[PDB]
């Protein structure tokens, strides 16, 4: 970034990749839940 | 302000630090002139003067012609000050010491708390309702059947694109945008080909918006050109767009019919098949809704405007049939302007 | 003219002795606004809005309404100078030292020569030609059949009246007039 910034364990690509992965996981969870309903 | 005496040795950086002679009056003159020229060229497009194709061409470039004329007018008056367009110096962050081009979700200077990572959903909820309502209502207005758009409009792809691009741009420290109503209506109107009073076709294409976006991006490098364009010319242009966007609204037409005698009233289904006082009661209820929304927008609680606007759907779908017949609602609230 | 700097101490009597800020621009604004309101009310008279009789009345008073509106606008802007109508103080001759109300045909300060008494017939002929052509062409224009004038017009009585009152007013040191077209 700019100026003096706090150094985290994860870099920006790593943290955004893990957040996108978590979002994809919960999206798939809701999709599978909706696929389970309206069928049984 | 207009005053008898002025200080002549006032500092001119970065903006007027005091009143200046001839500034407000010249801004008024420029705004009125560009609005007048735009309206005159709009009437020239529909006029019967000159070769018709040349008149259609000249009329198509009416707003650029007016802009150029008033820009030249302000250019040739050198002593008077008028506020000009100012663009950033370069493609740099607006504050170098606060952030970079990319934002770390875990924090810049201090650790971002865990609870706000989950609590950001509620402001995200509000932003989603705002953007959804604005964009989908703009799509509904622009893609009306009476506007003669045959290429189709997608209500699912555009919402996904706009909101996803906003969410991605938030990660880069950039604003999330929305499909604005006035700009989109003006863009559709500028691509509409009129028949021989009746809409004939619209030039639906991807190149015009792409070129506008590219020029907006390139505006930083076009500083020597934009620095000679006054804001008063653009204000007259905005007034032109505002008065132009009311052409296809039946609410505006009925508000005009309030000031217009019934015998004059046009041959439209909501006039010929609905009583005049019933039509005016319909218009008055719509006017009350407009006043309520304007009042809401005037309070600090102006972010609740989407919900109050949503509340007009239960109004039309429940309370309006309690006082209006189905015939009256079909004639007044018609999707494609049909006589039931 | 529009300048970066003006003199804030400028003599005001009888007329400003130098340029003043906001004067020309406000004059343009008042002129444009007056013309705009006059034309909008003229359109409104022929329009289809409001009771027709009210629209005809409002549209009949369109020019006075525009004049009143822009006069009020100039009235509320008191800091800016605008040139106003200047009417003489009283019913007196413009030069009390050069002539009186009645002019002697034989001279005021010098005896009038006899040759110019007969030589006044040529300027009189020129004045008669000018007044005749102006007045009679104006009468032709206003009394056209397409203007729906049913009361008739006078081409012999009006010329006689105009030129006769001009000749009489010449004796009092006053201008001779004519029927003005506009
Ligand atoms: C700017 C031109 C300079 C003048 C140069 C002098 C030369 C000059 O321009 O005049 C001759 C020429 C005659 O050619 P012509 O009559 O064939 O051209 C008609 C003209 O283009 C109309 O505007 C068209 O109607 P619309 O509007 O498309 O519906 C009409 O088509 P349509 O629809 O009837 O089938 C055309 O036929 O133009 C004029 O019409 C007279 C207007 C003079 C224009 C004068 C403007 C100052
Ligand atoms: C302003 C007064 C009315 C207010 C509320 C309006 C309701 C109200 O008070 O009813 C009176 C009248 C309604 O119209 P209504 O049909 O009763 O009366 C006609 C109306 O006066 C036309 O302007 C006349 O045209 P014109 O003489 O031929 O040129 C026409 O004369 P004619 O065809 O028979 O010869 C009249 O018959 O008002 C309006 O004009 C409507 C918009 C008014 C403007 C509303 C905005 C305030
Ligand atoms: C119904 C609406 C009609 C609109 C018509 C507009 C006419 C403009 C009159 C000014 C022309 C002129 O001649 O301006 C020239 C003037 C003054 O001349 P100068 O040589 O500097 O004076 C010196 C003479 N001395 C020796 C007596 C001192 O210069 C200026 O300060 C420039 C001001 C121009 C502003 C133009 C206003 C906006 C015009 C466009 C509006 C759409």
Swiss-Prot record, chain A:
Chain segments annotated as transmembrane: 15-37
The record's account of how the chain is modified after translation: The major O-linked glycan are NeuAc-alpha-(2-3)-Gal-beta-(1-3)-[NeuAc-alpha-(2-6)]-GalNAcOH (about 78 %) and NeuAc-alpha-(2-3)-Gal-beta-(1-3)-GalNAcOH (17 %). Minor O-glycans (5 %) include NeuAc-alpha-(2-3)-Gal-beta-(1-3)-[NeuAc-alpha-(2-6)]-GalNAcOH NeuAc-alpha-(2-8)-NeuAc-alpha-(2-3)-Gal-beta-(1-3)-GalNAcOH. About 1% of all O-linked glycans carry blood group A, B and H determinants.
Outcome reported for the amino acid change (mutating residue 1 to R): In ERIK antigen
UniProt subcellular location: Cell membrane
Reported effect, residue 18 to A: Diminishes dimerization
Effect after changing residue 14 to C: Diminishes dimerization
Resulting phenotype, residue 25 to L: Abolishes dimerization
Protein task: Component of the ankyrin-1 complex, a multiprotein complex involved in the stability and shape of the erythrocyte membrane. Glycophorin A is the major intrinsic membrane protein of the erythrocyte. The N-terminal glycosylated segment, which lies outside the erythrocyte membrane, has MN blood group receptors. Appears to be important for the function of SLC4A1 and is required for high activity of SLC4A1. May be involved in translocation of SLC4A1 to the plasma membrane. (Microbial infection) Appears to be a receptor for Hepatitis A virus (HAV).
Oligomeric and partner information: Homodimer. Component of the ankyrin-1 complex in the erythrocyte, composed of ANK1, RHCE, RHAG, SLC4A1, EPB42, GYPA, GYPB and AQP1. Interacts with SLC4A1; a GYPA monomer is bound at each end of the SLC4A1 dimer forming a heterotetramer.
Family: Belongs to the glycophorin A family.
Further remark: Involved in several unequal homologous recombinations or gene conversion events, predominantly with GYPB and more rarely with GYPE. The resulting fusion proteins are observed in different phenotypes and encode low incidence bloodgroup antigens.
Listed name of the protein: Glycophorin-A
Species in which this protein is naturally found: Homo sapiens
Swiss-Prot record, chain B:
Region ((Microbial infection) 5ABC region), start-end ranges: 173-207
Cytoplasmic side: 45-55, 138-153, 191-206, 247-284
Effect on the protein upon substituting residue 219 to P: In DRTA4; the patient has distal renal tubular acidosis and normal red cell morphology
Effect of residue 280 to P: In SPH4; Birmingham
Effect of residue 184 to P: In CHC; Hemel; induces abnormal cations sodium and potassium fluxes; decreases anion chloride transport
Effect of residue 99 to W: In SW(a+) antigen
Record annotation: effect of changing residue 99 to Q: In SW(a+) antigen
Residues lipid-modified (S-palmitoyl cysteine): 289
Protein family per UniProt: Belongs to the anion exchanger (TC 2.A.31) family.
Name of the protein in its database record: Band 3 anion transport protein
Organism: Homo sapiens
Lineage, broadest ranks: Eukaryota, Metazoa, Chordata, Craniata, Vertebrata
């Amino acid at each position: 970034g700019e100026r003096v910034q706090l150094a985290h364990h994860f870099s920006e690509p790593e943290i955004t990749l893990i957040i996108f992965g978590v979002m994809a996981g919960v999206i798939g969870t809701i999709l599978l839940i909706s696929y389970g309903i309206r069928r049984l | 302000p207009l005053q008898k005496t002025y200080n002549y040795n006032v500092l001119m950086v970065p903006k007027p630090q005091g009143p200046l002679p001839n500034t407000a009056l010249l801004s008024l003159v420029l705004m009125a002139g560009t609005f007048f020229f735009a309206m005159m060229l709009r009437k020239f497009k529909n006029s019967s003067y000159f070769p018709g194709k040349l008149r259609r061409v000249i009329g198509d470039f009416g707003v650029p012609i007016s802009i150029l004329i008033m820009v030249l007018v302000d250019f040739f008056i050198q002593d008077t000050y008028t506020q000009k367009l100012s663009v950033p110096d370069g493609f740099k962050v607006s504050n170098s010491s606060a952030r970079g081009w990319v934002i770390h979700p875990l924090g810049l200077r201090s650790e971002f708390p865990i609870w706000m990572m989950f609590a950001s959903a509620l402001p995200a909820l509000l932003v989603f309702i705002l953007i959804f309502l604005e964009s989908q209502i703009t799509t509904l207005i622009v893609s009306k059947p009476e506007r003669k758009m045959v290429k189709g409009s997608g209500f699912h792809l555009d919402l996904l694109l706009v909101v996803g691009m906003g969410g991605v741009a938030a990660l880069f420290g950039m604003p999330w945008l929305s499909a604005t109503t006035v700009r989109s209506v003006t863009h559709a109107n500028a691509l509409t080909v009129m028949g021989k009073a009746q809409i004939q076709e619209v030039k639906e294409q991807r190149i015009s918006g792409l070129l506008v976006a590219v020029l907006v991006g390139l505006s930083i490098l076009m500083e020597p050109i934009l620095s000679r364009i006054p804001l008063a010319v653009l204000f007259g242009i905005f007034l032109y767009m505002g008065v132009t966007s009311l052409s296809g609204i039946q609410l505006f037409d009925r508000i005009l019919l309030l000031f217009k005698p019934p015998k004059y009233h046009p041959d439209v289904p909501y006039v010929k098949r609905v009583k005049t006082w019933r039509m005016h009661l319909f218009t008055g209820i719509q006017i009350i809704c407009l006043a309520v929304l304007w009042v809401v927008k005037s309070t600090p609680a102006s972010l609740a405007l989407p919900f109050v606007l949503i509340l007009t759907v239960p109004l039309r779908r429940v309370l309006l049939p309690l006082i209006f017949r189905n015939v009256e609602l079909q004639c007044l609230d018609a999707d494609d302007a049909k006589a039931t």
